[PDB]
């Protein structure tokens, strides 16, 4: 009776022990094949008291995969050089960045936050047109942990999601938090077409998301900006 | 004043902790900040060390732990050029005067 | 559009060694290569309260038994022999050239630019200035910092030591010239053409510099003084500690490198107050104050940017200024 | 059909060691076998306020405030002796061969397609290029990195060692051949036979390298710094170590392997600034670029996707590129970053 949290899977040792007279099962904690936990929990423990014994790991794992890929971000800064006047989260650099420090000679730059700076000289309407075309979603963390041969918008190279990463952005254990009905009702499709995305292998009718499917639900979720 | 008073207990229960005053291997300053934090001489204490830490107070090391509340309020030119910094300062070295004459009035 | 980038540094020229300390009887200095070297030795010092404490304080028993504590102190302290009265002091100096490239650079277009910049500099004139100036600083023996004060006669030999052996000598009274002014010489002006051929790298430059000061008989001369930890008690060199290479007195190549670049003579808060060491900001230590200060616009920063960026090249003096700091080497970056 | 091997990984070949310093007075170039090592000691350094600052700062007061409490740090630092004026730097360097099969991989139709590409290199002209190339980074002593800089004379002798003894030696002046252009010599062609012949696995080489620097005395030497790790110090603690290896000034290993590989003349930025290391995208770190540049198809991924799954071969100067990067080794593959 394994139970399933998003792209997590928690699965019992299929042979019990008795620990201080009591029967208990070791409970392992997986990321996909990667082992993350065990533990030892009794029996006469509900799927729920199981879930919330592993809950503190998975978010921490949530914690720290938010701050490892989190987005850039650009910082608007005056003439002098210091007093930010806006900073915008961009999933990409503006390609026309290169190591500058800002004197008056232009009232507006664009600086990376990292510390030996880029920036560009902007007069707030290029900045405004920077911003609108390389902003980052609210969920653009999630493509860190996504293959990037499935998040790719050149369809030659690009591959379907298998169901493992499916589970990262559509479920209710899923980072994004989203079930599969409301999912469904974001792509026009009724939840049992959808749930036949989500089954695991070819043989039991699981048929592959298409191309503009899967790039306009992460567009919809919030994952990735998909212009 | 919490910190103050939690370092004057910590220093007092680490005194009272400690049977002995024992010799450390190679410890300059910080068997000089220990003599200020000593308890009385041992047999392995020399009589003359211990005359000369009981001869002088270490209100320097006072100094020391005021260099310690330096490490604990980071400072710059937003407090150093503003008003309010320097009277947190103020108020710091008072509390550091408070718990240096707490600390003056053992030994000595 | 092009800006300034934000790392930018510059590896120095002119660098020296660190200069030996050794002694001997003085006309004996045409025969100094087995002079004994100046061995740092160590002092007891024990002095009362000499310090400024906090006046109008009522309590003069407190003060008197703080006099009854000597607070012995152990000093590191270097004489010359009761037998000698000149002090030698040797290093080498090399000169490479190429003053104008960084060694390391974020924007190529702004790289190429400040290449350039120092290009028309060095068409519109030579290092000659500049290498007249060092040349200056190298023929007063200023490298001798408070071993010059009190000096009888102090006399420099340069060797420019082109193979294995010298291919030229000079030889100064560096009395004679003074700590002021940068007059001319011929023997002066042929070391200034050297260094300007090193600076300009059609050269391959390494001097042998030697200072010879009649001082006294066991005087005391004044190297390097090190950093030195608190941790320790009353001894161990509580107080004093002296730099010094294998068993010999020396001093720190950055003190003899400062001594070297004080040519700053533009600086426009005073003149007769003589040289400074170039810096942006251009600041001395022992003053405690900033001359070059940026709100007036003559610090190397704003020269820099307004020559290279705006095309506002400066006057001939503050050029000659920005090119001294690109010789002085440094970290410019925000 | 044929896609890429999601693991892929190449160990390196030409494998250099720890470079040693040592010092002592040129003509004892031949007796320098008891020269002395150069140490490291410590200084102190008091610094000024010579930064930029921001407009925060500049206020007069503050500036000179700043100037009042001054900055002192402790300072590794290597110098000569004042009667030595030559630098020897010496290290031993083993070309291995067997530059085309990965050390891991998961595909097999993708190792042997990749096998069978480095062997129709191979075939169609050996390693003489890239080991002329190498032989020439031998020979002018680019691993002196500083040391290198400024110096009157550099002479650089390699003694290919074949059993216990040396077997043949080679003697050049690293000064006459540049840094810039890959010249021709007969001893220097020989020196690439021997190293072409170790890159292709038909022997065993190593080699033993000893460069002399004609310095000055009593000069700055520049080992390999070290990485110092301090969380809330002191200040005045040390600022900067260097590397020794007992007690013995020292490069690093990989710092002389990058001075070996800077063959790279292939790039599409330039070729007036010179040879540039052997990196996937092309990268030096001191001008803060990246040549070869992926948005040109001239990086290593993109040539070696090209000339392995679709059979496009480049030019024969990209393949040198891509076999130079086949024998610096690395992770390549779906451990992407």
Same mark, same amino acid.
């Given at each position: 009776?394994?139970?399933?949290?998003? #792209?997590?899977?928690?699965?019992?040792?299929?042979?019990?022990?008795?620990?201080?007279?009591?029967?208990?099962?070791?409970?392992?904690?997986?990321?996909?094949?990667?082992?993350?936990?065990?533990?030892?929990?009794?029996?006469?423990?509900?799927?729920?008291?199981?879930?919330?014994?592993?809950?503190?790991?998975?978010?921490?794992?949530?914690?720290?995969?938010?701050?490892?890929?989190?987005?850039?971000?650009?910082?608007?800064?005056?003439?002098?050089?210091?007093?930010?006047?806006?900073?915008?989260?961009?999933?990409?650099?503006?390609?026309?960045?290169?190591?500058?420090?800002?004197?008056?000679?232009?009232?507006?730059?664009?600086?990376?936050?990292?510390?030996?700076?880029?920036?560009?000289?902007?007069?707030?309407?290029?900045?405004?047109?920077?911003?609108?075309?390389?902003?980052? #979603?609210?969920?653009?963390?999630?493509?860190?942990?996504?293959?990037?041969?499935?998040?790719?918008?050149?369809?030659?190279?690009?591959?379907?999601?298998?169901?493992?990463?499916?589970?990262?952005?559509?479920?209710?254990?899923?980072?994004?938090?989203?079930?599969?009905?409301?999912?469904?009702?974001?792509?026009?499709?009724?939840?049992?077409?959808?749930?036949?995305?989500?089954?695991?292998?070819?043989?039991?009718?699981?048929?592959?998301?298409?191309?503009?499917?899967?790039?306009?639900?992460?567009?919809?979720?919030?994952?990735?900006?998909?212009? | 004043?919490?910190?103050?008073?939690?370092?004057?207990?910590?220093?007092?229960?680490?005194?009272?902790?400690? !049977?002995?005053?024992?010799?450390?291997?190679?410890?300059?300053?910080?068997?000089?900040?220990?003599?200020?934090?000593? !308890?009385?001489?041992?047999?392995?204490?020399?009589?003359?060390?211990?005359?000369?830490?009981?001869?002088?107070?270490?209100?320097?090391?006072?100094?020391?732990?005021?260099?310690?509340?330096?490490?604990?309020?980071?400072?710059?030119?937003?407090?150093?050029?503003? !008003?309010?910094?320097?009277?947190?300062?103020?108020?710091?070295?008072?509390?550091?005067?408070?718990?240096?004459?707490?600390?003056?009035?053992?030994?000595? | 559009?092009?800006?300034?980038?934000?790392? *930018?540094?510059?590896?120095?020229?002119?660098?020296?060694?660190? /200069?030996?300390?050794? /002694?001997?009887?003085?006309?004996?200095?045409?025969?100094? &290569?087995?002079?004994?070297?100046?061995?740092?030795?160590?002092?007891?010092?024990?002095?009362?309260?000499? =310090?400024? *404490?906090?006046?109008?304080?009522?309590?003069?028993?407190?003060?008197?038994?703080?006099? &009854?504590?000597? =607070?012995?102190?152990?000093?590191?302290? /270097?004489?010359?022999?009761?037998?000698?009265?000149?002090?030698?002091?040797?290093?080498?100096?090399?000169?490479?050239?190429?003053?104008?490239?960084?060694? $390391?650079?974020?924007?190529?277009?702004?790289?190429?630019?400040?290449? &350039?910049?120092?290009?028309?500099?060095?068409?519109?004139?030579?290092?000659? %200035?500049?290498?007249?100036?060092?040349?200056?600083?190298?023929? =007063?023996?200023?490298?001798?910092?408070? =071993?010059?004060?009190?000096?009888? $006669?102090?006399?420099?030999?340069?060797?420019?030591?082109?193979?294995? %052996?010298?291919?030229?000598?000079?030889?100064?009274?560096?009395? $004679?010239?003074?700590?002021?002014?940068?007059?001319?010489?011929?023997?002066?002006?042929?070391?200034?053409?050297?260094? /300007?051929?090193?600076?300009?790298?059609?050269?391959? @430059?390494?001097?042998?510099? @030697?200072?010879?000061?009649?001082?006294?008989?066991?005087?005391?001369?004044?190297?390097?003084?090190?950093?030195?930890?608190?941790?320790?008690?009353?001894?161990?060199?509580?107080?004093?500690?002296?730099?010094?290479?294998?068993?010999?007195?020396?001093?720190?190549?950055?003190?003899?490198?400062?001594?070297?670049?004080?040519?700053?003579?533009?600086?426009?808060?005073?003149?007769?107050?003589?040289?400074?060491?170039?810096?942006?900001?251009?600041?001395?230590?022992?003053?405690?104050?900033?001359?070059?200060?940026?709100?007036?616009?003559?610090?190397?920063?704003?020269?820099?940017?307004?020559? @290279?960026?705006?095309?506002?090249?400066?006057? @001939?003096?503050?050029?000659?200024?920005?090119?001294?700091?690109?010789?002085?080497?440094?970290?410019?970056? %925000?």
């Amino acid at each position: 009776n394994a139970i399933h949290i998003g #792209p997590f899977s928690i699965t019992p040792a299929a042979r019990g022990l008795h620990y201080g007279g009591l029967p208990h099962h070791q409970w392992t904690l997986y990321y996909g094949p990667r082992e993350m936990a065990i533990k030892t929990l009794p029996d006469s423990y509900t799927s729920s008291e199981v879930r919330d014994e592993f809950s503190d790991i998975i978010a921490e794992f949530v914690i720290d995969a938010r701050h490892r890929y989190a987005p850039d971000v650009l910082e608007l800064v005056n003439s002098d050089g210091d007093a930010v006047l806006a900073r915008v989260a961009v999933s990409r650099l503006p390609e026309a960045l290169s190591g500058c420090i800002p004197d008056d000679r232009f009232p507006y730059w664009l600086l990376t936050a990292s510390r030996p700076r880029l920036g560009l000289p902007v007069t707030l309407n290029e900045y405004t047109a920077l911003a609108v075309e390389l902003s980052a #979603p609210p969920l653009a963390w999630i493509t860190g942990l996504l293959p990037g041969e499935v998040l790719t918008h050149d369809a030659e190279e690009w591959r379907p999601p298998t169901s493992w990463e499916l589970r990262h952005v559509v479920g209710e254990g899923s980072f994004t938090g989203v079930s599969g009905a409301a999912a469904a009702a974001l792509l026009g499709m009724s939840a049992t077409n959808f749930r036949k995305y989500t089954a695991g292998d070819s043989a039991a009718n699981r048929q592959k998301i298409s191309f503009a499917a899967w790039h306009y639900l992460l567009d919809r979720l919030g994952v990735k900006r998909a212009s | 004043g919490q910190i103050c008073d939690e370092a004057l207990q910590y220093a007092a229960r680490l005194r009272e902790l400690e !049977p002995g005053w024992s010799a450390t291997p190679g410890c300059q300053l910080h068997d000089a900040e220990q003599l200020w934090l000593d !308890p009385l001489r041992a047999q392995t204490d020399e009589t003359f060390l211990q005359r000369r830490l009981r001869g002088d107070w270490p209100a320097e090391v006072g100094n020391r732990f005021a260099n310690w509340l330096n490490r604990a309020v980071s400072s710059d030119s937003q407090i150093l050029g503003s !008003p309010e910094a320097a009277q947190w300062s103020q108020e710091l070295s008072k509390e550091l005067t408070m718990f240096k004459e707490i600390l003056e009035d053992e030994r000595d | 559009i092009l800006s300034t980038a934000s790392v *930018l540094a510059f590896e120095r020229k002119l660098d020296p060694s660190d /200069a030996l300390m050794s /002694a001997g009887a003085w006309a004996q200095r045409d025969a100094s &290569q087995e002079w004994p070297a100046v061995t740092v030795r160590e002092k007891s010092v024990r002095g009362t309260i000499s =310090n400024r *404490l906090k006046t109008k304080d009522r309590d003069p028993a407190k003060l008197d038994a703080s006099i &009854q504590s000597p =607070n012995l102190q152990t000093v590191d302290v /270097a004489n010359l022999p009761s037998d000698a009265d000149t002090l030698k002091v040797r290093f080498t100096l090399r000169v490479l050239g190429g003053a104008g490239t960084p060694s $390391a650079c974020n924007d190529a277009a702004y790289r190429d630019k400040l290449l &350039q910049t120092v290009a028309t500099y060095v068409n519109e004139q030579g290092f000659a %200035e500049l290498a007249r100036r060092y040349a200056h600083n190298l023929a =007063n023996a200023r490298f001798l910092w408070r =071993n010059r004060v009190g000096a009888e $006669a102090v006399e420099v030999r340069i060797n420019h030591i082109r193979q294995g %052996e010298v291919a030229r000598t000079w030889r100064f009274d560096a009395l $004679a010239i003074g700590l002021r002014d940068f007059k001319a010489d011929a023997e002066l002006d042929a070391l200034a053409e050297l260094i /300007a051929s090193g600076l300009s790298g059609s050269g391959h @430059v390494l001097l042998e510099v @030697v200072a010879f000061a009649r001082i006294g008989d066991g005087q005391e001369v004044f190297p390097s003084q090190e950093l030195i930890l608190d941790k320790g008690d009353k001894k161990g060199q509580k107080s004093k500690t002296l730099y010094s290479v294998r068993d010999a007195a020396a001093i720190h190549s950055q003190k003899i490198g400062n001594a070297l670049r004080t040519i700053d003579t533009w600086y426009p808060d005073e003149d007769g107050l003589g040289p400074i060491a170039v810096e942006p900001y251009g600041s001395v230590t022992s003053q405690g104050k900033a001359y070059r200060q940026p709100k007036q616009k003559l610090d190397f920063y704003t020269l820099l940017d307004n020559w @290279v960026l705006r095309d506002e090249a400066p006057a @001939v003096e503050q050029q000659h200024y920005v090119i001294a700091n690109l010789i002085r080497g440094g970290v410019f970056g %925000e």
